[PDB]
Amino acid sequence: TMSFFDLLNERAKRSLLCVGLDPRAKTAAAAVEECKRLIEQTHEYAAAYKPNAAFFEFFGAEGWAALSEVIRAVPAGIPVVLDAKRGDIADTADAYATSAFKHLNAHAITASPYMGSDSLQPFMRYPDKAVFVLCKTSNKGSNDLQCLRVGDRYLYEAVAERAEGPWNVNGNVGLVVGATDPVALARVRARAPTLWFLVPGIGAQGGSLKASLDAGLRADGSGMLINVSRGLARAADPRAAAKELCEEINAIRFKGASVELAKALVDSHCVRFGNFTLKSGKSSPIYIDLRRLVTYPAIMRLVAREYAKVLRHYKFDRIAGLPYAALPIASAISNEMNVPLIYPRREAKAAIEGEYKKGDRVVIIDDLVSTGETKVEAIEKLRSAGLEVVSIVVLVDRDMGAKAFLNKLGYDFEAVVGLHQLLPLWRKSNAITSQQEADVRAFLGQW
Amino acid sequence: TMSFFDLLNERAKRSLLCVGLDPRAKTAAAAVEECKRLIEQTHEYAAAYKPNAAFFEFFGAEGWAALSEVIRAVPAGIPVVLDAKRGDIADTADAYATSAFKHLNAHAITASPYMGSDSLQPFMRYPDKAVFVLCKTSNKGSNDLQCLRVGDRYLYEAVAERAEGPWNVNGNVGLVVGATDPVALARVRARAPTLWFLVPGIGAQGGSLKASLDAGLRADGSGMLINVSRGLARAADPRAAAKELCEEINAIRFAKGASVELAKALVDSHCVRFGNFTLKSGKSSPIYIDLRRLVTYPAIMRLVAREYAKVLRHYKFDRIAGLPYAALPIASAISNEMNVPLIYPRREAAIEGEYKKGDRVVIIDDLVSTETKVEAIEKLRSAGLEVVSIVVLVDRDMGAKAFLNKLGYDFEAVVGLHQLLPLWRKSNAITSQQEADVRAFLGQW
Amino acid sequence: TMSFFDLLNERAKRSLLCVGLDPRAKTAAAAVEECKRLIEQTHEYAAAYKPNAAFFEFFGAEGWAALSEVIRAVPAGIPVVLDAKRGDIADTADAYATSAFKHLNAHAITASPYMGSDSLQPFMRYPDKAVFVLCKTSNKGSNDLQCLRVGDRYLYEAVAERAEGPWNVNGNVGLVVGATDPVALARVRARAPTLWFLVPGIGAQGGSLKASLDAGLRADGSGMLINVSRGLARAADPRAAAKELCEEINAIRFKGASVELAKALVDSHCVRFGNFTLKSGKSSPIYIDLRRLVTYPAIMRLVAREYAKVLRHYKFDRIAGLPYAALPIASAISNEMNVPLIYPRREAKAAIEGEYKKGDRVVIIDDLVSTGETKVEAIEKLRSAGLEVVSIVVLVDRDMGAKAFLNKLGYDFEAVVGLHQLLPLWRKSNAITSQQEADVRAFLGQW
Amino acid sequence: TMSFFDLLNERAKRSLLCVGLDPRAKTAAAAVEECKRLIEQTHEYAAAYKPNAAFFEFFGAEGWAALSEVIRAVPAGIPVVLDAKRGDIADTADAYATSAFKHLNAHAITASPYMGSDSLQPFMRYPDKAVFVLCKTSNKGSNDLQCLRVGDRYLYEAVAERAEGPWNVNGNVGLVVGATDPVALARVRARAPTLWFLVPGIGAQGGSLKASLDAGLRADGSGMLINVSRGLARAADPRAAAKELCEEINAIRFAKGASVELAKALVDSHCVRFGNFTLKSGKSSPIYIDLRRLVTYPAIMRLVAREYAKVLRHYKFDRIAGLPYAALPIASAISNEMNVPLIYPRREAAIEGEYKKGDRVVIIDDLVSTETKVEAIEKLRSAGLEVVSIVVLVDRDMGAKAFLNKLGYDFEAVVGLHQLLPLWRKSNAITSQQEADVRAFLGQW
Numbered sequence A, C: 001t002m003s004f005f006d007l008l009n010e011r012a013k014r015s016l017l018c019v020g021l022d023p024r025a026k027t028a029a030a031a032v033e034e035c036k037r038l039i040e041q042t043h044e045y046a047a048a049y050k051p052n053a054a055f056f057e058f059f060g061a062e063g064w065a066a067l068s069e070v071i072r073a074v075p076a077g078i079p080v081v082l083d084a085k086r087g088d089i090a091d092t093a094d095a096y097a098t099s100a101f102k103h104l105n106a107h108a109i110t111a112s113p114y115m116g117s118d119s120l121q122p123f124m125r126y127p128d129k130a131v132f133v134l135c136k137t138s139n140k141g142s143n144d145l146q147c148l149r150v151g152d153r154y155l156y157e158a159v160a161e162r163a164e165g166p167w168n169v170n171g172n173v174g175l176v177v178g179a180t181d182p183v184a185l186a187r188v189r190a191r192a193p194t195l196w197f198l199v200p201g202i203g204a205q206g207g208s209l210k211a212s213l214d215a216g217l218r219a220d221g222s223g224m225l226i227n228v229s230r231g232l233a234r235a236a237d238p239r240a241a242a243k244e245l246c247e248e249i250n251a252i253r254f255k256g257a258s259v260e261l262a263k264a265l266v267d268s269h270c271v272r273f274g275n276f277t278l279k280s281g282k283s284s285p286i287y288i289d290l291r292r293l294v295t296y297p298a299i300m301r302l303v304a305r306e307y308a309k310v311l312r313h314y315k316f317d318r319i320a321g322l323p324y325a326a327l328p329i330a331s332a333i334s335n336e337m338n339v340p341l342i343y344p345r346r347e348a349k350a351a352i353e354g355e356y357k358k359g360d361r362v363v364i365i366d367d368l369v370s371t372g373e374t375k376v377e378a379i380e381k382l383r384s385a386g387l388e389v390v391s392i393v394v395l396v397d398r399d400m401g402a403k404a405f406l407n408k409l410g411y412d413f414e415a416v417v418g419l420h421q422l423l424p425l426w427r428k429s430n431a432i433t434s435q436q437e438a439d440v441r442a443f444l445g446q447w
Numbered sequence B, D: 001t002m003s004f005f006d007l008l009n010e011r012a013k014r015s016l017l018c019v020g021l022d023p024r025a026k027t028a029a030a031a032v033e034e035c036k037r038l039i040e041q042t043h044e045y046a047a048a049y050k051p052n053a054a055f056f057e058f059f060g061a062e063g064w065a066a067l068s069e070v071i072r073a074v075p076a077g078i079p080v081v082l083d084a085k086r087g088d089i090a091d092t093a094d095a096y097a098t099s100a101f102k103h104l105n106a107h108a109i110t111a112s113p114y115m116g117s118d119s120l121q122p123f124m125r126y127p128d129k130a131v132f133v134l135c136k137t138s139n140k141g142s143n144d145l146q147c148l149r150v151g152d153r154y155l156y157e158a159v160a161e162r163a164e165g166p167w168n169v170n171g172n173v174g175l176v177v178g179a180t181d182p183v184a185l186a187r188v189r190a191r192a193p194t195l196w197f198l199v200p201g202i203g204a205q206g207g208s209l210k211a212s213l214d215a216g217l218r219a220d221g222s223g224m225l226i227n228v229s230r231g232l233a234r235a236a237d238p239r240a241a242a243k244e245l246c247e248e249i250n251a252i253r254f255a256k257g258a259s260v261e262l263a264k265a266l267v268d269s270h271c272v273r274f275g276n277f278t279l280k281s282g283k284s285s286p287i288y289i290d291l292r293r294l295v296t297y298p299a300i301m302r303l304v305a306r307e308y309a310k311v312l313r314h315y316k317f318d319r320i321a322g323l324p325y326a327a328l329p330i331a332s333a334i335s336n337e338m339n340v341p342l343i344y345p346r347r348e349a350a351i352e353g354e355y356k357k358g359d360r361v362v363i364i365d366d367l368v369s370t371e372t373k374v375e376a377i378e379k380l381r382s383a384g385l386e387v388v389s390i391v392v393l394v395d396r397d398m399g400a401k402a403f404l405n406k407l408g409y410d411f412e413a414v415v416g417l418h419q420l421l422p423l424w425r426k427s428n429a430i431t432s433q434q435e436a437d438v439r440a441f442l443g444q445w
């Protein structure tokens, strides 16, 4: 089995956009049509899909068979949140729970806090499924009841507290916080700093796409499903609209600055252009030589500083820098962090310099990755000598499908910046010519 | 076209029983059959039917057509409460309100208060339909959130306030208050004296029928829908178990005479006290009755009003008149419970309040002995108001009724002094010596 | 002696606007002139004044003598916050503390958290003076350092926590939170729900006058000094600008709704017009008869509900309703709250009905107040029988100077709504004619 | 027109003493006199003067004209650090920056980092002036906020990072790091290898002079302003106490030879180990030196670099060349500390790094015995690079210096094997038997 948050965190590495499936059509058949078409258009950029029962229940009996088809018409990788807003006495709630998880095969459900936790356990007892409790709602008359003071704090805050504490027995509980109220959104994140937030209101209702995000995002730069329903269904080109939102969201979250790094690579003469031939016979118009970094200790300290931001998220004992290029970089990083360095002697009863135990956790540091052929030689030489490779961290990801290769190889990977990300900056800084940019852009389409 | 309450008040003349339709069946077809059977057996004694959507929704596509079938199997005149607990943003809520009222043809719906008034407006705008907002729910986990304090009152008490106030624009807002908590029932009834409650908890959840009614009923003796679902579906004979409940509920509503809790309260409240008092009649008395101090015990003051209302229920009048000072706050308490306008003459121990000439009033006083009631009872009759009756809490059994009838004035008391004797022997409010002395004191008349 | 918060809470009952005195003038003499003129214009509506040392220190020696004159040119009732942003080692900080409190006679100072609490004690040790520590600053580059994560929360939050806990030894500490960042403002209020906030940024810097207030106001609807400096000094009519802000702030805080109450009074035929003569010989065009409320139990329950909002802020044992008009109202209130009622028999060995002990705390409930002549008869009859009068609460304050009379008499007072407040609503609702409004408005100018 | 650092580096050739001017005087006139007296006595040995505004601000109007007078009483060439700790919004900050630089004519100012870079920009835009940002302050309450963790490093360490990085646009950003905490001094020096520190805490606050310098000084032996204020104002003879400090500071900066902490680290780090090793010379040895494993101890690796830099200080070169593998990370550590570009030949046990023909390089290796150094030392000389010297950490005292001089190559070591003997006897890093065997092993040459 796999839980909702397993599936969701996977898509959260890519996007946070949740597609609201709210039919509104001539008939029940028409309703299915619109949705099917809305699924196929958006699925690449969609973190989640959210059918709201109301618009399906509108069509009566034909509407229920309609909801079930639309739910199965979702590719097996985008979690489906049923917006049903259930909440009744345990025994009645049970029937609602089986209907949503066993009959409709939804991965998550919306619910009301009002009837207490014993009304929510019937839904929360499913460890694989998620429950998003209503906290602060997007509607203007939410403050009518939710903004009442329960001594020191508002009611929704009291809800938030309970949602993270007494109720989150097995890490299932999410909260519904509305985008039209950024101030309330921020307060719930202060009360539930860990939880996931289902956030509607963007498009038809209000906005504050940025203000919302600055308010309720976690330390990880994740934990907000931004839901747009009517806004995409009334849109002209849903695929473009979906992409635009996905990107607009991703541009606000995260990198971090990347602008000063871009300069550093150019001030170090690392970026060079021509007809270079890599270890593949195939020629690239651009070559990045981070071996030059050695002649600029100040830039090298900056580079090491960028690596640290990535490496602050992994638990490890030692650093394994791969000579030549990476070894000075790895030395610099080692200095910023105060973590022991290790390095494989470039050859074919250890061939490994430094000091390692057996089964201590290392992170492989390399300069850049194009494909991953080099990254394998190293993982095999290191797991050889009895070391657990945590990940590989790199300054520049050349964007030749290096992540996916390594993932399917087993060990995961992360890069500080991508080649595609650096291009717009260099052009802006006049470091790269118009022809140089489009040449590189064209080269990356092959992959 | 004909309102949910129009229908209900008419059925409520004979029954307050709400037959619940939560079918636990093998298939959706069996569910309809199970419900059909249950409707045919019980309808003569049912005030309303309440199908809970969950159980029909269990069977998906066929299940929904089953819900529609069960609703249309209800005889015209019996209203149908759809228990669906709706609540979302206004735009979404419309689809829920249409579905319930226009497609399914339900007469009312249950709903959550959490999303505020604008979320309930799409339901409440249908004037002919009704909305029961969740207030204090039957489950024990109600205490977990509804019992948080919002200043001086509970959260559900604040929900009660909005329901009976800002939200009841179209006069069609009721409340779901569980039978398992009678303290809650009193407190919601205190905040909402006129609203209908939908009351679940009898049977499967083991609520108390007597305790719920006494705490929960309106002034008019008929503002509660007692819902029973599994208690009837599990019964070997639904028609007889519906009859037994319908009767039991009725005998409690229409019961005439004062309660043990009233009789006890009075002694605790010290409105009736024992001492060695000597009267203007020169003869001494072991007991004195002072309802002046009733103003310090607001909960007792509610009880008193409810007890006055029981009597006042059988009269026809436009307004109530309270006599200052002792009976002004008492009258005000009644005036709240019944929702009838009040009136008072000044300079007692002009007339404020709106009154027209020929209005029918009932005069409220605290006590009647023998002498001072007949004097102020006429400063009102002078203004052209019609005294229907003089109603009092305690009659000292000193020939007031007789004396006032001779003067052509109608009279009635809630409890007589003799009647209190067994009522507070039933709760040990009074000792046997204390009984003997009161009994012997009365023997002189 | 009197503390800063004593003086400030006094003005906070009226306004929250803080006037920034930031000279910017030809000479030091010119600087004094501008400020003197800016003081006289704004003082009625000003909660606080804030000279920022920089603009005075600009003028050197003549600038220091200038600062001191401007500080004394502030009427003895508006607290003066020196924006100096001090913070050094204890021994050096001492000199700065004496310079601000003993030499310049400022009531409060701004300071930096950076050097720890031992650098702030030299300022906090003055129990009469206040200290506003920098938390989240209004400048765009505030996030550069303040928005760093100290595990789970931001740096300014860590500051906020310390400001309310370890540092607030004698209730002196305030926080400087900027108006241009409403989201950060809300988070600091979640970390310091009790503290006072000095809030600049409105006018020249940004805005969000409302968004700011919805974020950082306490449960009491107070605890934010909104500071405008350059915005008022560049303004054409400072007195009008000051009033406009003061009102715009006060209209957002608080009443509460008041709109449904207005209707209720009209639906109850309580508001009547003519040539009425009150217990004073002087004639009023308007008479409000709340004795009619008795014929509308539903409205009476609403009226009682309004009184409760006021009465939720006082600690008391019993309620003393004054017959006739107030006794039914008091009965209704008694019912909403479950508090024992007491009433003085309308006459001249108690003459008081109910049940009271000796020295239990009562609140006098009356219908409306015009002057206060009646409110005295009652306070004297009640303190006679051995009762501590907490306050008097009223539905309608007729606005004939009733508050000030009673205050100077000793017992304080509060009203649910003022006559001036009800007028605009009734006109909007068409309940009052144009001539009726202007007649009443004209009548209230006498007072 | 002439930069604060231009002035300082020139004074720093003879002194690192900063004379502080915090007058505790009866009147403002006495303050000027007190300060004047203090300037005249100390200027010959003062690198900078630092008046703290607080004490001048104490006397209000006259006090400010006193500050201006004291500043203008400083001889031209000696720079003046105004300790005012400024920081507000940019628009306000301008008035503070003008006041300091243009009115008062100070050459640098101290400032808080709390308000971010845009708040410091109004100061930092004056290229000729300098800004000392508060980093780790002298007071014990520094630990209270500056020592909070921001991921993996302290808050002050993050301040250090920004100061030496994003903020030092005009090359005029220094740091205030207190003398009372040498651990902090090392850690800030680690993050900012090139920045000047303003160092308070000597005297009144009882900082350690030796501990502060060793931890705090740059590679060039001259990147610290040692501030003393009350320690000199209270002194009976300022001129002599300034001289005593100026000398003491200098003897520590210019001290030649390896440290006890270096010698000890090596043994702990296990770079020098004792066993029963047998060499290629066939004769056995009780000690072996391997600096390959230096990569696991980054703090030691810093020490090593600082020690290399002490030697390299007296040479003239453009770049440093590191020999892989043992000496590549070592060279990189030096390259960081000194801020000089590095170079390395490949295929060791082409040349990467930018180099032009005729560049002057210093070759860095870990160790020298006798044989393999002379071979790769020429793959560089071949590329047209000029080998100024071959510098090494440990000399085994086996006639390397002599042998290399014969080949016309300049050579130097940080510590010799003989020299280590008393250095780690001074910390018990080695036993007397362990000394005897090493001593006897050397006697063979």
Ligand SMILES: O=c1ccn([C@@H]2O[C@H](COP(=O)(O)O)[C@@H](O)[C@H]2O)c(=O)[nH]1
Pocket (backbone or CB within 6 Å): A020, A022, A052, A083, A136, A137, A138, A139, A176, A177, A178, A200, A201, A202, A203, A204, A205, A227, A228, A229, A230, A231, B088, B089, B092
């Ligand atoms: O607090 C909430 C919870 C859920 N939704 C649901 O999210 C969708 C709003 O998206 P849109 O159509 O306004 O863009 C609707 O289906 C609505 O029912 C809200 O808008 N606010």
Ligand SMILES: O=c1ccn([C@@H]2O[C@H](COP(=O)(O)O)[C@@H](O)[C@H]2O)c(=O)[nH]1
Pocket (backbone or CB within 6 Å): A278, A286, A287, A288, A289, A290, A325, A366, A367, A368, A369, A370, A371, A372, A373, A374, A375, A402
């Ligand atoms: O533009 C490039 C392409 C490749 N490499 C070298 O290629 C090796 C990584 O190859 P791989 O991980 O893609 O197989 C890196 O260590 C790097 O030194 C570069 O330096 N620049």
Ligand SMILES: O=c1ccn([C@@H]2O[C@H](COP(=O)(O)O)[C@@H](O)[C@H]2O)c(=O)[nH]1
Pocket (backbone or CB within 6 Å): A088, A089, A092, B020, B022, B052, B083, B136, B137, B138, B139, B176, B177, B178, B200, B201, B202, B203, B204, B205, B227, B228, B229, B230, B231
């Ligand atoms: O606060 C409430 C609201 C609704 N119900 C409904 O009552 C019906 C069950 O009644 P019974 O099984 O106790 O007879 C169920 O549909 C349940 O949802 C409650 O019990 N308590």
Ligand SMILES: O=c1ccn([C@@H]2O[C@H](COP(=O)(O)O)[C@@H](O)[C@H]2O)c(=O)[nH]1
Pocket (backbone or CB within 6 Å): C020, C022, C052, C083, C136, C137, C138, C139, C176, C177, C178, C200, C201, C202, C203, C204, C205, C227, C228, C229, C230, C231, D088, D089, D092
């Ligand atoms: O975080 C802060 C702290 C203080 N101030 C001060 O408040 C005033 C800003 O008002 P204004 O001129 O921008 O309207 C200035 O004196 C400024 O120094 C800020 O703007 N932001």
Ligand SMILES: O=c1ccn([C@@H]2O[C@H](COP(=O)(O)O)[C@@H](O)[C@H]2O)c(=O)[nH]1
Pocket (backbone or CB within 6 Å): C278, C286, C287, C288, C289, C290, C325, C366, C367, C368, C369, C370, C371, C372, C373, C374, C375, C402
């Ligand atoms: O327009 C008015 C003016 C006065 N009063 C009566 O005046 C008394 C209060 O007078 P005082 O408190 O201003 O002296 C109140 O109890 C109230 O009953 C009114 O009812 N309506």
Ligand SMILES: O=c1ccn([C@@H]2O[C@H](COP(=O)(O)O)[C@@H](O)[C@H]2O)c(=O)[nH]1
Pocket (backbone or CB within 6 Å): C088, C089, C092, D020, D022, D052, D083, D136, D137, D138, D139, D176, D177, D178, D200, D201, D202, D203, D204, D205, D227, D228, D229, D230, D231
């Ligand atoms: O982190 C700091 C920053 C500045 N000072 C300044 O040092 C001067 C006092 O030096 P002394 O009395 O210890 O010699 C004072 O002006 C004080 O403000 C410190 O001691 N520590």
Ligand SMILES: [Cl-]
Pocket (backbone or CB within 6 Å): A323, A324, A325
């Ligand atoms: Cl390489």
Ligand SMILES: [Cl-]
Pocket (backbone or CB within 6 Å): C323, C324, C325
């Ligand atoms: Cl009156």
